[PDB]
Design a protein around this ligand. Structure first.
Ligand code: NA
Ligand code: NA
Ligand code: NA
Ligand code: NA
Ligand code: NA
Ligand code: NA
Ligand code: NA
Lengths: 147, 147, 148, 148, 147, 148, 148, 147, 146, 148
């Protein structure tokens, strides 16, 4: 049950993005006891995630890859174009590399820099992190059942 | 056993998704008498269907692959990005392996985890499962009729 | 002074009453304009989602100089259609670039459409137009690709 | 210097899309004086452009391709699904043939077959034609430049 | 040390420029001027993907930057092109393995009024800097993996 | 058993608005044997309906008023503002005057001056006009019942 | 005590609207065993509800008024204008006459005339009817509380 | 030949265009009523200042009909609809009040980015609307008189 | 002394209450129990305007507060009622010349989940506070005039 | 004699709204040789503006009233309902009192409390504040011209 997962996280909204990484690694290492090794990679923005996901996936060292990012409507420029390119990007990379890439690259309906908002997500990203972990494990497992 | 069908269903909303998987398997039997055997593969979320579809398709074991998941606007984050990446992804995967990927990866216009809503889709997926069942039998047939 | 070829008309079983209208119409014009010179072979596919692949499978047989995907992709009020429509409209596009075999789209998505004598009648009738057009488009693009 | 440009135009809304073409041609005529040859290629709809461009692009005959079409919202069926596939498609081709495919496949925000509207674009497509020409000349030279 | 291909659309130069100007500037300041930044002018954003691909493919750049101000013209629908482009780069960078940072911004609103114009003229300087801080960021991070 | 009805119709899209007026004016006669008279008042556009209805209603000669217009989205300027002000306007006038004011001030989801469109509504307003006709006899008679 | 309620309902979609009416009257009885008298009034469509409600409220005979109608997006014309005018009407009327006018004039997000939807709303209206009853007994009570 | 006075209230905003409607308005009326119909202009800050002016003017009884003219565009910075509504509704409210026809040439275009082409188009198109307003002006004034 | 009328819709009571309780809490605080907040329960938001009126007319209240959680249920449109209400209070207050504050909130998103319910249960307290501060401020400001 | 203007500014977003006010007063001060007395009235939110506006308008003390507030999409609850009631309110009021009520109750399209944002509008409200001043004076003037 020993396998490596590459956790790529955007440097943006790190205060929140990290809560997921932390929760993720937590949940993981807390159901694998170090068996599942979570390597962590920092990328500038969500947009730099996919390629990174590919390069890492091609090393063949990871049984799964995790893209973590908080893609928000910055209020100034449109996020969805990237948001799309990134969700598609990963999807493409996993179909290319045959390496599961889970998406914890979330985009909320709303989110204006402010406490009320920030808090909520800083919190909720911990749930996603967990969920991610379970998902990371479940898929890597199910994949083995097949092969 | 004339032919196999991989039914890849997501974990989320299994309460409802299951309703479609159950009616899908049932109909195949009602229509084929067990001639066609359906094999169920569980996966975390809809996002893991494409690759799982790819992987399975490529084994050549199945004459068709069904992807089922209830992808809804999850109150907090946008669902599109994922859904699109999924519906498109399967489309990609079938065009790539020439193995039909039927989609039962539905996205309702509205859905608030409420009694009314839940019971509607719990009831509806049954319908959608019976249709997918028929669709499969058909497209599978139609295709053999081609070569 | 007549050249001939084969067209593969793929149509989704959903809304057949309406879709058929395009098919029947598509076929009728090519009969008027080509008088059998151009043969239209019809393939029934479940949903619009089942078109891109069938089209690719058929286009690769090289028997056809053009594939036609006819489908009435609607917003059923229950689930979102666009995800699939997209996948399909894109899908055919992908196929044609992959097989360099023209795949015309008669896979239409109305802005609004509630089951009803008024709506149904409208498209039932309108698909007859969209079918003729598809014909002239089929002929037009097939001939043009030949010139090359 | 001299090179050839393949101009692919959809037959729909000819009166308008034609304007862009004429402008395109004239501009280049001016800016190159018979040096740059623009080969016109008709195609039924915008959907028919991608593949077409893909086919011409592969001949290596053209230094750049230009898809021209006025894709609007017909008011009956959603257009975008197509516009998307077309705008994405041409991109798909240029990226896979490394042949610049300039886009003059414009999609107005609003456009009911009215006088005002028709006259506006019929007029505006002329401006678009010129830009396309410059964009053409510019992208063609900028490439051969980063190629030396 | 390394080189970066900065492909900028000619449209909305007064603005896009401000982004390039600060990009090159930041890199000089941050790399003591050890990172060569080659500038490439393309007609419009739609022309960027291909140019990124050709340059990227030359294997002369550690990363590529696509800069363009793709706004809603008011006459025609931009998002189509916007998407084609933002996607393209994504496509291209996976294809090439060369990272393509995006400074192809599509503001929510922009009517070329004094207020507006000056606003993005100012912001693109900011955006150009982040681009710089993202380029070095990604290029570094990558090699780190390559060792 | 008899009473008068004020039929206020916008002059825009008479061709379509008319089909309703005619349906209405006939359906009534053909169901009250000319007992009920329908008086037609032309007015420029929908916007000019509310006030007209108020003025007419206040004369107390009509048992009810019917505003009929085709408030389309011209594609140039936004129709909704007027549309809102009008549907609300008639609602306002009918509450003031306590005289029914049926609304055949329809706003289609789409309408581009096209054959298909124009025909569809030309045919529909006929229907909508009959309904309004019944709704009139209904509400009038009904308010009468509640009175006694 | 013995007070009366004016239940105004449109004909359109009676099959569904009625369930609410029935649920309302039934359940209302069940909580009042006939103490509260529910007087039903038929009106063509939602648009004629405000006025009727007004006229009826003014009689002073009712302690509350209920508006029942299913204002759907017919798919052809925009409903919201009316939907609005009507919800605002009842609102206006209740403010103008200080006679509670509860709204069971529901406009669902999606509803394309099919068995799917029909059944759901034919059934759900039964709920909205029960709630409407409670809402009525509640407001009529809480109001008379303020009387003391 | 009948003769009546009309009060044309125009918002000073975008007079570049609104003026075109005013001119063609008076133009037509001249040409169509040989001067028997007097149009009296009233300048007002913004569209929002029309309803009140309309009412003030209406109450005098000197006008058979009032015309509110203004181009209420989407500034691109603040939402214009809130105002557009109050004004279009206000004029409605006022005409209902005074029972003096208040025609609306307070147009709100779908798109408008102070382009040269946009500006030319509307500078051009208002002429039409202005005329159309004149016709309706005579139209309703005459139709009311007959009561 | 002066008293305020708090008209609270019952739907989503759990969430609205916080606003109420919080409102009353802050109000008594900033005014050492000198202000009497009269709570009036009412079915749904739609019933808030008329009540706010019937009360406003009594003369008894210095200001009225409509409180409700107008959500997009996912089945029928809310905006219609929401508007009619938010407009209604606005109207009733111009009629009665009695401040009527709005704590009739319509969240951008709210799907009956634990996260949402939890968030808003909290936020409505923050709102009740602001409601109190406004009530005082405007009740004050109005008297600062006349 | 002398004249005053009632400037009702909402407490929220003072940093920004204040600019509109300061420059509003600044301009009028200039343009009227200081003969205008711009009385400031603070109010919790934009919602409390209408009533204040009416209360103040009735006094007859002011020749014009200005409502100022920065109503935005707070990302949590919807603003538009309130924004509407406000913009409408002021309109309702001035029509009632026949006292010009100018609106500096601006709602921007996007405003995520960021630096670039906060600064933009802080700088902008200065402008709008001046616009409002030139408007206030312009209308007061204009009306002063009407009554002969
Ligand atoms: Na399917
Ligand atoms: Na086609
Ligand atoms: Na181009
Ligand atoms: Na250069
Ligand atoms: Na109610
Ligand atoms: Na008019
Ligand atoms: Na208007």
């Amino acid at each position: 049950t020993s396998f490596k997962i590459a956790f790529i996280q955007a440097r943006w909204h790190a205060d929140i993005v990290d809560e997921a990484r932390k929760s993720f690694v937590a949940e993981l290492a807390a159901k694998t006891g170090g068996s599942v090794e979570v390597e962590i990679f920092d990328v500038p923005g969500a947009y730099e995630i996919p390629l990174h996901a590919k390069t890492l996936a091609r090393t063949g060292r990871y049984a799964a890859i995790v893209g973590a990012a908080f893609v928000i409507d910055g209020g100034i420029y449109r996020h969805d174009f990237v948001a799309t390119a990134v969700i598609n990007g990963m999807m493409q990379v996993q179909l290319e590399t045959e390496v599961p890439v889970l998406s914890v690259v979330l985009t909320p309906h709303h989110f204006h820099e402010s406490k009320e908002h920030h808090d909520f997500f800083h919190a909720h990203f911990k749930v996603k992190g967990v969920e991610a972990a379970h998902a990371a494990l479940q898929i890597v497992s199910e994949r083995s059942r097949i092969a």
